[PDB]
């Protein structure tokens, strides 16, 4: 028996490095990890606090979003209302 051949480190290293490296978290989940937007300071502040919702109408603003989700800061296009900001 050998302790170097039983316990491998490339399973945890490749799993964490691969999951935090690619968009997938293992397709189940995709688009979790995104490159940080360094266009300005408010883009990084509004980028880190950005919350996503996977695909009643979920795009419309609900009354329970008072004080929790910004009623104005939301992108336009296909992902309108699915992306939210704290």
């Amino acid at each position: 028996f050998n302790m170097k051949l039983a316990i491998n480190a490339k399973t945890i290293t490749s799993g964490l490095k691969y999951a935090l490296a690619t968009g997938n978290w293992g397709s189940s989940r995709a688009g979790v990890s995104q490159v940080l937007n360094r266009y300005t300071y408010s883009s990084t502040l509004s980028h880190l606090r950005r919350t996503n919702t996977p695909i009643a109408k979920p795009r419309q603003l609900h009354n329970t979003h008072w004080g929790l989700v910004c009623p104005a800061e939301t992108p336009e296009g296909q992902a309108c209302g699915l992306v939210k900001n704290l």
């Binding site: 028996f1 050998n2 170097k4 480190a9």
Partner: protein
């Protein structure tokens, strides 16, 4: 909480991979033909049916001579309940 090892890293990293230190812990370590013929007939007197490997484990001697002594006076049964046995 989780304890952070504060050492110079190189010691622990040396203990990780190859460190020229193995073992240190026990875990999952795990002839005259006539006389041989007479002895074989004595074993036949004890019991007629015996496997060739068992005879090689009882007579305790070079096995080639024992095989040649079994191919002359005994017949090898390959099938049946006494399979792989000389009688």
């Amino acid at each position: 909480r989780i304890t952070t090892l504060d050492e110079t890293v190189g010691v622990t990293m040396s203990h990780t991979g190859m460190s020229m230190r193995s073992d240190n812990s026990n875990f999952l370590k795990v002839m005259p033909k006539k006389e041989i013929l007479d002895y074989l007939f004595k074993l036949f007197d004890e019991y007629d049916y015996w496997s060739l490997k068992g005879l090689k484990e009882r007579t305790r001697q070079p096995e080639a001579h024992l095989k040649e002594c079994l191919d002359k006076v005994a017949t090898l049964v390959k099938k049946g309940p006494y399979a792989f046995k000389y009688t």
